[PDB]
Ligand binder design. Structure first.
Ligand SMILES: *Cc1cc2c(cc1C)Nc1c([nH]c(=O)[nH]c1=O)N2C[C@H](O)[C@H](O)[C@H](O)COP(=O)(O)OP(=O)(O)OC[C@H]1O[C@@H](n2cnc3c(N)ncnc32)[C@H](O)[C@@H]1O
Ligand SMILES: *Cc1cc2c(cc1C)Nc1c([nH]c(=O)[nH]c1=O)N2C[C@H](O)[C@H](O)[C@H](O)COP(=O)(O)OP(=O)(O)OC[C@H]1O[C@@H](n2cnc3c(N)ncnc32)[C@H](O)[C@@H]1O
Ligand SMILES: *Cc1cc2c(cc1C)Nc1c([nH]c(=O)[nH]c1=O)N2C[C@H](O)[C@H](O)[C@H](O)COP(=O)(O)OP(=O)(O)OC[C@H]1O[C@@H](n2cnc3c(N)ncnc32)[C@H](O)[C@@H]1O
Ligand SMILES: OC[C@H]1O[C@@H](O)[C@H](F)[C@@H](O)[C@@H]1O
Ligand SMILES: OC[C@H]1O[C@@H](O)[C@H](F)[C@@H](O)[C@@H]1O
Lengths: 576, 576, 90, 90
């Protein structure tokens, strides 16, 4: 712990690590603080799902996700338990209890919102879907030249894809993937296009996908080390970053207040450049705790003088979900090229096909796997191989279907009844709607109540806006129903539903980006620099000022790359 | 990966690490293999619950436990789902599916049995309760001299307590602990004694308990290193140990077959001494896969010639559970020494007490905390401070109450209704019965079906024995009901119940210890040496041949210490 | 058509449930393994609790039920009486 | 309808029921038979079903019908949690 660094980064999630990669590599002397701890093995900040045991027991991983999502704001519980024994002590009111936030209106909450405090942040458990935004979802980096703007985003996204190792080829030989993809491609021919979900992942074997993480962007090892003898990087875990100290004119940050959670000591760290990548909730908390915006219940007139748009225009996506059980038509089609004689397990049973036949619907590799599976497992009534990877299908957001789609399999805790249904049959559907940015939709912080780290307690005042956002959310539900029906019926216990607000964890706009602070009601410019400040930058989904449905991390990373280019343009690294 | 070591240990759980500590410290050249991976941060094999974030959100840790318990044997699912859409594909039978074990009779299972594959084993998530066994629960180490036998166990347990850092003082200043403890102590005066649960843990602060683990016994760092320049230790994670190679006479093990799960390669490792500490299930699997006992459905006559008792006489404990909501009597007693005037939150409200008064039921420290809490939180109707640690109470197994008891709080996923009840009110009750060892109670392995690591698939043939075990299990339920009623009524949603067989994870007797292989129907002697073998040793709960209710790990560790003394007596470490 | 049911209409669901007796119930094969060790338990899922051993549970009309009362099912029915068009009609 | 305690949170005036009924093609293999061995509570031959919804048109229309309910219901409001679109038992 030196007192002085070239750059300090708050947060070791994938966006913090974007800054670290860019800036450590350019020869800045970098310090990174995370309030969480190293928690993912010897590869610091790696995806927890890359253990052999999780790749063999993938639904167990749902626990790992649940175990590191701590709810942001829980309303007072008013549920009546009246089957207590008469001896049991009971209050006469539903008092503030069990860590609930008394400031939170339960009917204006993002109840599903949660944060993760670990080195690697949420990239230690995330799903790895990294789609680009098209124009209608994306903030402008170049004013009045849409082709220039596209070009800039294409460069940024290409580099971001490189960092995350995004690809659309890891599932190309899956029977289930191809089955679902083909059917949808045919059913929406000339209307929608389908492809593999772009995933930040590298296949290592037919049963092992190394999911990308923060560690993929930046290995988080202290430097100089053998591999980077000329780089300077330190990671300080278990450090609560509390406050950035503003100069009088609000033109520079002078230091960072940190609290070492293991020793209990509080220090100040100085740096030329301060980067806040603490997540959409906690960047905001840190800023509000440093005298940006305003502490307390926003009151209608009496706006904050410093960054009045901070924590306003917040967006979270609507998320609809179901599972389906694959249709008979689709299962039969798997084995459409086979001649099947006799009945399974009897002496006369056989399954054959003619390789290369021009009337075959599938290529030989498909038919070989099916035939082998059918002959070698005559106790199994399904023609799909047991280790066949899962479907990873999308039709990306478009003006005529303005929502993101994932038609796939993720870890899931199946109920005992649903466990009756063979897993090969099951497909997950998650559709994500875009939410219009509205001033009245806020994340604020209590001036009285604190969180578990003694920081101002976040509170939401949010409803999905009326008009287009709501109407599209209901069209999106309908679209999932219509689309899913082409693949199979719903799985009982996983019928079409909206998920609780904020469960998708795609919160944006909390510290939002634009060209002009006043005219675009924003907090950072397109370099992610906080307006007025020479050396303060915010990274992450909180910057995104638009209505978007697609998964936002790639877009956040792209903005972070641009922010880093700025820092390289304006700050000299110190002599080594 | 050298080809030759002095000692090889299979498994990096707390019992493997007992061997490592003993033998690495004595100057043996030690190799340790675990099929799992490093997963608990930079302190290898540490308790996952020792992060600041888990100590602030303790119920989240239930997910961490669930996420690393993989079920040993799951029967074929026969549950009817008949609300599928008519288009959905459905089999005509309940075929073998979703990793279920077709060999497993669902009505003779230990359905709750699960294993953990991670460096540190189950000690990365365990509850840390480390009680001694009294004579009636404990195997004999010394024949025909009960005082000699006691002395030997006392020495072994003392050292085991040292390794685990077991104490009974970490909760001494908890209001809730003292409340429950006092009430029970008074109610069973002259009949039962109560104390703190002996816990393998060190308190670091009033809100932080560093829970012990494998890492506590042995830090698992490769050696020689700076701290131990003269020790030789290597840990090889992600290595499936498959088979121990027996000589012709069954008098020596010649090598260990290993499978590197990252490279895919298979090697043989040689050693003077082989120690198997893979857990009660997997020690047995490894032995059966090496030609000990017999593969397949045990058939009634046609016993295995080599270690015929292996996987017979298995014991698992009965576990009963409830939660209670603290009585009015008990809550009022917290504040019995206070004068309370007015009504909370009004100008005239006050709470006072006279320090040192001889008629006070509590000591000044209790009364100060209560008074302060009451005055400073007048919105809170309870007199218990918010960060008051949890109760950690037991009455240890005795002949007149032959079950272990824990009256405490562990991580729990509270339902939304139960979340209505203030957490300070809630106490967990878990009572554990002893199970008589019976020949017909078996763990066997399929000769046809394999597990996720391609090893013979474990299958249970178990029922809790008739007679004493069953009768005591029902008395134990009754005792929990009677005892819990003294503290409060049951919490709805957590009413008194038996847990599924094997959920307690205290499986024993699978490779059981005794003096004489034939006369005590056992597999290892009191040095934990496998009968006939000069250089094969088994560690862990599988050795315990008795009916026990208390948590077995301390007893296993004690046996491992004795086994290590033997190894030191008979094997020379190689020159460094 | 009682005043009390017209004032508490959702209570009438009970009246319907109380006179629908299932036509054919398959043998129950559900595992209960949280019984006390003292409780008596069979070793198989034997024919039990009025289940029909002839019924394949995966070829059933599990929701089929009959009503035995004067008035039959018209004592509880919903009263919807649409005509069939040609394509539905004999 | 027996509303669950959560669904009882939603004002009844808001709630609309949707029930769509599909037609089933008559097929020879779809049978109601009676046991020659087992009897019912009135000692009469025990009914037994051998039924599946037929393949082809009946199934396909049943799934279009589900879809139609989803599409149509969306014009009136969102689904009520606890009463999400589902097939009822046969
Ligand atoms: C949990 C989750 C998240 C996502 C997916 C699925 C699941 C279940 N799926 C997904 C996501 N995003 C994608 O684009 N596609 C996918 O398929 N998920 C969200 C994604 O994971 C996040 O958008 C992303 O990590 C954001 O990265 P970030 O902006 O770097 O933020 P993180 O939350 O990852 O990490 C921040 C970080 O900083 C710390 N912290 C917080 N407060 C403080 C303070 N005051 N001081 C110091 N450090 C602080 C944390 O401990 C944390 O590590
Ligand atoms: C999960 C759990 C366990 C316990 C508690 C609570 C919970 C939820 N509470 C508890 C326990 N015991 C106590 O005495 N008191 C407490 O309050 N729990 C059980 C305790 O945790 C176990 O008894 C103990 O770890 C046993 O230690 P061990 O005999 O060293 O076995 P482990 O299972 O911990 O680790 C073995 C290990 O070896 C590996 N392995 C398995 N098979 C192979 C093969 N073939 N090759 C190589 N390595 C193998 C694993 O990966 C594992 O790490
Ligand atoms: C229960 C139900 C039924 C209908 C509606 C809703 C509910 C929950 N809604 C509905 C119906 N039909 C409509 O067209 N529109 C609506 O909105 N329901 C069905 C309708 O109720 C039936 O189709 C109709 O009653 C048929 O009338 P039925 O052919 O006269 O048959 P029932 O079942 O009403 O009565 C027969 C009757 O005979 C007796 N019985 C049976 N076995 C014997 C023997 N062996 N011996 C002597 N008597 C016997 C019964 O006791 C019964 O009363
Ligand atoms: O359930 C919510 C999550 O689900 C996944 O399917 C997505 F990939 C995510 O982007 C999102 O956070
Ligand atoms: O629930 C089962 C477990 O519960 C705890 O309370 C005990 F400490 C354990 O020894 C045991 O494994």
């Amino acid at each position: 712990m030196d007192i002085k660094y070239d750059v300090v980064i708050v947060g070791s999630g994938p966006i913090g690590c974007t800054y670290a990669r860019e800036l450590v590599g350019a020869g800045y002397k970098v310090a990174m603080f995370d309030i969480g701890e190293i928690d993912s093995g010897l590869k610091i900040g790696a995806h927890k799902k890359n253990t052999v045991e999780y790749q063999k027991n993938i639904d167990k991983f749902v626990n790992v996700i649940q175990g590191q999502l701590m709810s942001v704001s829980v309303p007072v519980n008013t549920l009546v338990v009246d089957t207590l024994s008469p001896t049991s002590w009971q209050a006469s009111t539903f008092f503030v209890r069990n860590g609930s936030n008394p400031e939170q209106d339960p009917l204006r909450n993002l109840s599903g919102q949660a944060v993760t405090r670990v080195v690697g942040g949420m990239s230690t458990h995330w799903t790895c879907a990294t789609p680009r935004f098209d124009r209608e979802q994306r903030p402008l980096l170049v004013k009045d030249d849409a082709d220039a703007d596209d070009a800039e985003w294409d460069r940024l996204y290409t580099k971001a894809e490189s960092y995350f190792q995004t690809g659309t080829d890891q599932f190309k030989e899956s029977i289930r993937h191809n089955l679902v993809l083909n059917k949808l491609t045919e059913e929406y021919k000339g209307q929608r296009d389908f492809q593999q979900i772009p995933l930040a992942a590298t296949r290592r074997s037919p049963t092992f996908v190394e999911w990308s993480s923060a560690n993929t962007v930046f290995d988080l090892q202290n430097r100089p080390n053998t591999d980077a003898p000329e780089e300077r990087f330190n990671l300080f875990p278990a450090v609560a970053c509390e406050r950035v100290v503003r100069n009088a004119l609000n033109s520079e940050i002078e230091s960072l207040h940190i609290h070492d959670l293991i020793s209990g000591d509080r220090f100040e760290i100085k740096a030329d450049v301060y980067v806040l990548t603490a997540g959409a909730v906690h960047n905001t908390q840190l800023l509000v705790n440093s005298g940006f915006g305003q502490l307390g219940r926003p009151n209608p007139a009496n706006p904050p003088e410093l960054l009045p748009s901070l924590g306003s225009y917040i967006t979270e996506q609507s998320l609809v979900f179901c599972q389906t059980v694959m249709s008979t038509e689709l299962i039969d089609s798997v084995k459409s090229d086979m001649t099947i004689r006799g009945t399974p397990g009897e002496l006369t049973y056989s399954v054959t096909y003619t390789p290369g036949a021009s009337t075959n619907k599938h290529p030989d590799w498909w038919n070989e796997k099916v035939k082998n599976h059918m002959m070698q497992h005559q106790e199994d009534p399904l023609p799909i191989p047991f280790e066949d990877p899962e479907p990873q299908v999308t039709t990306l957001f478009q003006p005529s279907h303005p929502w993101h789609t994932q038609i796939h399999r993720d870890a899931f805790s199946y109920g005992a009844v649903q466990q009756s249904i063979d897993s090969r049959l099951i497909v997950d559907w998650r559709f994500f709607g875009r939410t219009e940015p509205k001033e009245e939709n806020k994340l604020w912080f209590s001036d009285k109540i604190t969180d578990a780290y003694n920081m101002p307690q976040p509170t939401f005042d949010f409803r999905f806006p009326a008009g287009r956002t709501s109407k599209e959310a209901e069209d999106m539900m309908t679209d999932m129903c219509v689309m899913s029906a082409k693949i199979g019926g719903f799985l009982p216990g996983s019928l079409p539903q909206f998920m609780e607000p904020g469960l998708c964890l795609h919160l944006g706009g909390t510290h939002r980006m634009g060209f002009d602070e006043k005219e675009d009601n924003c907090c950072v410019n397109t370099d992610s620099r906080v307006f007025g400040f020479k050396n303060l930058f915010l990274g992450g989904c909180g910057n995104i000022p638009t209505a978007y449905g697609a998964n936002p991390t790639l877009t956040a990373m792209s903005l972070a790359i641009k922010s880093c280019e700025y820092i390289k343009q304006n700050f000299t690294p110190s002599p080594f």
